[PDB]
Design an enzyme around this catalytic site. Structure first.
Site, PDB file in Angstrom:
ATOM      1  N   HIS A   1      45.943   9.173  59.247  1.00 18.54           N
ATOM      2  CA  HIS A   1      46.935  10.226  59.097  1.00 18.54           C
ATOM      3  C   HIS A   1      48.258   9.492  57.944  1.00 18.54           C
ATOM      4  O   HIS A   1      49.059  10.221  57.282  1.00 18.54           O
ATOM      5  CB  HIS A   1      47.576  10.728  60.257  1.00 18.54           C
ATOM      6  CG  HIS A   1      46.709  11.641  60.850  1.00 18.54           C
ATOM      7  ND1 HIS A   1      46.944  12.103  61.942  1.00 18.54           N
ATOM      8  CD2 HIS A   1      45.138  11.755  60.728  1.00 18.54           C
ATOM      9  CE1 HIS A   1      45.823  12.871  62.441  1.00 18.54           C
ATOM     10  NE2 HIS A   1      44.783  12.601  61.739  1.00 18.54           N
TER      11      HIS A   1
ATOM     12  N   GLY B   1      50.217   7.448  50.106  1.00 11.43           N
ATOM     13  CA  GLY B   1      49.040   6.873  50.637  1.00 11.43           C
ATOM     14  C   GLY B   1      49.479   5.928  51.997  1.00 11.43           C
ATOM     15  O   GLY B   1      50.152   6.214  52.730  1.00 11.43           O
TER      16      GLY B   1
ATOM     17  N   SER C   1      54.674   5.658  55.555  1.00  8.95           N
ATOM     18  CA  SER C   1      55.468   6.897  55.689  1.00  8.95           C
ATOM     19  C   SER C   1      55.467   7.575  56.854  1.00  8.95           C
ATOM     20  O   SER C   1      56.366   8.132  57.511  1.00  8.95           O
ATOM     21  CB  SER C   1      55.114   7.857  54.587  1.00  8.95           C
ATOM     22  OG  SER C   1      53.627   8.603  54.805  1.00  8.95           O
TER      23      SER C   1
ATOM     24  N   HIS D   1      35.464   8.124  65.537  1.00  5.54           N
ATOM     25  CA  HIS D   1      35.035   8.937  66.694  1.00  5.54           C
ATOM     26  C   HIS D   1      34.257   8.308  67.511  1.00  5.54           C
ATOM     27  O   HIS D   1      34.068   9.139  68.706  1.00  5.54           O
ATOM     28  CB  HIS D   1      34.758  10.597  66.238  1.00  5.54           C
ATOM     29  CG  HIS D   1      35.703  11.395  65.511  1.00  5.54           C
ATOM     30  ND1 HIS D   1      35.989  12.501  65.542  1.00  5.54           N
ATOM     31  CD2 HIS D   1      37.203  10.743  65.189  1.00  5.54           C
ATOM     32  CE1 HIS D   1      37.081  13.098  65.072  1.00  5.54           C
ATOM     33  NE2 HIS D   1      38.025  12.035  64.829  1.00  5.54           N
ATOM     34  N   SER D   2      33.605   7.195  67.309  1.00  3.96           N
ATOM     35  CA  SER D   2      32.678   6.700  68.207  1.00  3.96           C
ATOM     36  C   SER D   2      33.855   5.709  69.300  1.00  3.96           C
ATOM     37  O   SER D   2      33.208   5.515  70.305  1.00  3.96           O
ATOM     38  CB  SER D   2      32.070   5.571  67.687  1.00  3.96           C
ATOM     39  OG  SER D   2      31.179   4.823  68.510  1.00  3.96           O
TER      40      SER D   2
ATOM     41  N   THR E   1      30.614   6.465  74.726  1.00  2.00           N
ATOM     42  CA  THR E   1      30.945   5.184  74.852  1.00  2.00           C
ATOM     43  C   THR E   1      32.249   4.736  74.239  1.00  2.00           C
ATOM     44  O   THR E   1      32.580   4.298  73.120  1.00  2.00           O
ATOM     45  CB  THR E   1      29.779   4.057  74.117  1.00  2.00           C
ATOM     46  OG1 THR E   1      29.558   4.573  73.055  1.00  2.00           O
ATOM     47  CG2 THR E   1      28.504   4.188  75.166  1.00  2.00           C
TER      48      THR E   1
ATOM     49  N   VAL F   1      33.284   1.431  72.932  1.00  2.00           N
ATOM     50  CA  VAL F   1      32.064   0.641  72.304  1.00  2.00           C
ATOM     51  C   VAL F   1      32.069   1.333  70.893  1.00  2.00           C
ATOM     52  O   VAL F   1      31.821   2.419  70.670  1.00  2.00           O
ATOM     53  CB  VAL F   1      30.590   0.399  72.936  1.00  2.00           C
ATOM     54  CG1 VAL F   1      29.764  -0.422  71.985  1.00  2.00           C
ATOM     55  CG2 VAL F   1      30.870  -0.188  74.326  1.00  2.00           C
TER      56      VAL F   1
END
Ligand code: HEM
Ligand SMILES: *[C@@H]1O[C@H](CO)[C@@H](O[C@@H]2O[C@H](CO)[C@@H](O)[C@H](O)[C@H]2NC(C)=O)[C@H](O)[C@H]1NC(C)=O
Ligand SMILES: *[C@H]1O[C@H](CO)[C@@H](O)[C@H](O)[C@@H]1O
Ligand SMILES: [Ca+2]
Ligand SMILES: [Ca+2]
EC number: 1.11.1.7
Length: 336
Positions: free
Chosen positions: A48, A67, A71, A176-177, A196, A199
């Protein structure tokens, strides 16, 4: 080449300050080099921070964002009011104090803490770390962070504007793992996105492709979809990306190889880390980042489910041969 005070061998004296930042983050922010909520929150923050970058706004005569400029910390008053930036202020404040105490830029610190946090999570690749981003920033424009209720078209258009191809969107989502939600469904706090969450593995890509059968909480939260077993949360954007013809083959190709997934994620994260910057004007301090403990576990379809429970969505490629397990279905504990 260079010897820092601490005994520390490095490539450039600009790297020496980061060994102290490493020690501080590992003891304090990471509570003894762990792979828990702090890492996960920092991964939200790195995305973000960086994604507030819009060439289309620049082309339309407007400030598009700087970028990876810090910020989200410097201008946290404004950015933490954005829909996607909830549940981050406590983490942002911790980072603010570290940045000020060690005298490093907020943009560099977020990238550094990302690489260090990843290094605490079994199976992670070694992320690049570059130093030198100016501490100066303007607030991100609003409406630049993809939301979990957005269509695939909207997500790819936004990510595309920032600079990422559809493949690279899939690659970045390997984060998202190592993931849960807290703010979508308050009844199942820290419900993991994969089996997991400590992991860094392909389970996320496998499990999002399973048939949705299960409502993990007593009602649905925002952008929530049925998941494949108790305890696991599925957000609509992940469900849709797994199945959409524009992203499904890359998604499927992630399922069998932790090693290819890590390479792709490392490359995409390197790209994201320098939105708003010239990487050639930065100093490479990647040697400050240690390797993570290796992950020895094989990809698996959990809980007695089989490939028949996978909604195979890449129409040209057979689903990889992935090991199955014994039933019954698991129930995921909250992510730590
Ligand atoms: C298509 C784009 C994506 C969308 C729509 C999206 C959406 C979300 C949402 C809604 C949450 C749950 C936050 C909460 O309620 O607590 C989440 C969590 C998370 N996301 Fe994303 N995300 C996306 C891409 C990424 C990327 C690129 C990264 C970083 C490289 C990332 C890292 C994470 C992590 C680590 C969490 C877990 C946070 C926790 O356990 O506290 N996400 N994401
Ligand atoms: C990076 O810029 C931010 C914003 O100017 C600086 O943050 C302020 O730092 C002062 C002095 O330590 C604190 O009193 C303020 O609370 C901070 N404000 C914000 C919004 O965080 C930061 O010090 C600058 N860092 C460097 C290395 O110059
Ligand atoms: C099954 O069990 C886990 C805890 O072990 C819960 O997190 C889940 O919601 C389900 O009750
Ligand atoms: Ca930013
Ligand atoms: Ca995982």
């Amino acid at each position: 080449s260079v010897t820092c005070p601490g005994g520390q061998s490095t490539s450039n004296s600009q790297c020496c300050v980061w060994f102290d930042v490493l020690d501080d983050l590992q003891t304090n922010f990471y509570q003894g080099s762990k792979c828990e909520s702090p890492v996960r929150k920092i991964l939200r923050i790195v995305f973000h921070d960086a994604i507030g970058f819009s060439p289309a706004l620049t082309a339309a005569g407007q400030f598009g964002g700087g970028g990876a400029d810090g910020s989200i910390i410097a201008h946290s008053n404004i950015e933490l009011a954005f829909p996607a930036n909830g549940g981050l202020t406590d983490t942002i404040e911790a980072l603010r104090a570290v940045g000020i105490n060690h005298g490093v830029s907020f943009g560099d610190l977020i990238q550094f803490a990302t690489a260090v946090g990843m290094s605490n999570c079994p199976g992670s690749p070694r992320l690049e770390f570059l130093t030198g981003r100016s501490n100066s920033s303007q607030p991100s424009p609003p409406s630049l962070i993809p939301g979990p209720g957005n269509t695939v078209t909207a997500i790819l258009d936004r990510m595309g504007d920032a600079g990422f191809s559809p493949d690279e969107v899939v690659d970045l989502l390997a984060a998202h793992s190592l993931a849960s939600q807290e703010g979508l469904n308050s009844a199942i706090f820290r419900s993991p996105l994969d089996s997991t969450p400590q992991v860094f593995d392909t389970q996320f890509y496998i499990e999002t492709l399973l048939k949705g059968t299960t409502q993990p909480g007593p009602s649905l939260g925002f952008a929530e979809e049925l998941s494949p077993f108790p305890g696991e949360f599925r957000m609509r954007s992940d469900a849709l990306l797994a199945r959409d013809s524009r992203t499904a083959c890359r998604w499927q190709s992630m399922t069998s190889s932790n090693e290819v997934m890590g390479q792709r994620y490392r490359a995409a994260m390197a790209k994201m880390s320098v939105l708003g910057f010239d990487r050639n004007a930065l100093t490479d301090c990647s040697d400050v980042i240690p390797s993570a403990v290796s992950n020895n576990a094989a990809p698996v379809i959990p809980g007695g489910l089989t490939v028949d429970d996978i909604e195979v969505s890449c129409p040209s490629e057979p689903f990889p041969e992935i090991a199955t397990a014994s039933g019954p279905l698991p129930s995921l504990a909250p992510a730590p």
